[PDB]
Ligand binder design. Structure first.
Ligand SMILES: Cc1cc2nc3c(=O)[nH]c(=O)nc-3n(C[C@H](O)[C@H](O)[C@H](O)COP(=O)(O)OP(=O)(O)OC[C@H]3O[C@@H](n4cnc5c(N)ncnc54)[C@H](O)[C@@H]3O)c2cc1C
Ligand SMILES: NC(=O)c1ccc[n+]([C@@H]2O[C@H](COP(=O)([O-])OP(=O)(O)OC[C@H]3O[C@@H](n4cnc5c(N)ncnc54)[C@H](OP(=O)(O)O)[C@@H]3O)[C@@H](O)[C@H]2O)c1
Ligand SMILES: [Mg+2]
Length: 257
């Protein structure tokens, strides 16, 4: 009664560390884009569950998840072996802090992510309502290597032409991939590129200010710590709590061991 069992519909491995899967969505699972649920498997006769951002949008028929693969991680050491037709467990009470309703009004929305932390923004960039709220939405995704830029084709080619969303996306979404460990046009960590001025110059926007710029952050605990400092120094005020407005919102992409 705490979870539903759903059939897996697709599985795609981007790298040795990242994969995407989709599954049937229960008719009762309503959610706000950006929220997370619990996802898992039956293991040793009991559910084995972990928090996962819903990567699909709430208007989409199926669920999508973007997942790490940790070879000695209790869940994903098993989850990495999903096949089409397998069963996964999905919980029933979505929650989380990455909800657009909690943002103060602004002109620009920075979606700042590393690694699998792009996951809630796969959902939010498919929310038609976010595009009316901002003049520009800047999806920043930092990863180690070019191969780790999962969804590169979605954001450079597909989404601007989307039959439902393209008229909203094409003039407003700016995709800013960052690669830290090999040659690339945006090189290093998003924190350094924001402080140095390079990110703003590349995208053609003015420096972040408290009147115009809002953000959502999803990444490692260390990335959140460093990125919060950057935004605080720019003069932004974090939301103190779910349901309370702020200039920016944060959520941990995982918990350190
Ligand atoms: C709010 C929230 C949302 C989350 N959403 C997602 C999501 O959409 N996709 C996802 O892959 N994970 C997500 N995570 C992490 C997820 O809950 C699990 O940690 C993940 O499924 C790994 O589970 P595990 O049992 O295999 O390993 P764990 O025992 O949970 O972790 C093992 C090791 O891997 C590290 N680790 C775990 N997950 C990640 C990750 N995603 N990226 C980098 N290092 C990681 C841990 O810090 C630890 O060192 C989320 C976590 C939280 C708190
Ligand atoms: N070997 C690989 O090619 C590869 C690729 C992906 C995932 N993985 C594995 O998967 C797990 C998770 O790795 P991940 O790469 O997804 O996550 P990650 O270690 O958090 O790194 C993702 C990106 O975030 C950057 N970053 C790290 N700390 C930061 C901070 N404080 N502020 C801003 N940016 C920061 C990293 O830059 P830096 O390069 O400076 O660390 C990298 O570009 C690990 O076990 C890892 O070994 C490995
Ligand atoms: Mg819904």
């Amino acid at each position: 009664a705490a979870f539903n069992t759903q059939k897996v519909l697709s599985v795609h491995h981007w790298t040795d560390a990242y994969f995407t899967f989709t599954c049937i969505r229960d008719e009762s699972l309503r959610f706000e884009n950006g929220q997370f649920v619990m996802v898992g498997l039956m293991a040793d006769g009991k559910p084995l569950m972990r928090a996962y951002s819903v990567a699909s949008a709430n208007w989409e028929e199926h669920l999508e998840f973007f997942s790490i693969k940790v070879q000695d991680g209790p869940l994903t050491s098993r989850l990495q072996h999903l096949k089409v037709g397998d069963e996964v467990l999905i919980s029933k009470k979505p929650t989380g802090t990455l909800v657009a309703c909690d943002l103060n009004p602004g002109k620009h929305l920075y979606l700042l992510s590393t690694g699998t932390g792009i996951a809630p923004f796969l959902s939010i960039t498919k929310d038609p309502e976010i595009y009316e709220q901002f003049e520009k939405i800047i999806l920043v995704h930092g990863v180690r290597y070019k191969k780790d830029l999962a969804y590169y084709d979605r954001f450079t080619k597909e989404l601007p032409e989307h039959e439902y969303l393209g008229d909203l996306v094409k003039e407003k979404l700016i995709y800013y991939p960052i690669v830290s460990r090999e040659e690339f046009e945006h090189r290093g960590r998003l924190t350094d590129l924001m402080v140095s001025g390079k990110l703003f110059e590349d995208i053609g926007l003015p420096k972040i200010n408290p009147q115009d710029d809002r953000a959502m952050l999803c990444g490692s605990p260390a990335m959140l710590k460093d990125t919060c400092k950057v935004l605080d120094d720019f003069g932004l005020t974090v939301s103190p709590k779910t349901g309370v407005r702020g200039d920016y919102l944060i959520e941990r992409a995982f918990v350190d061991q």
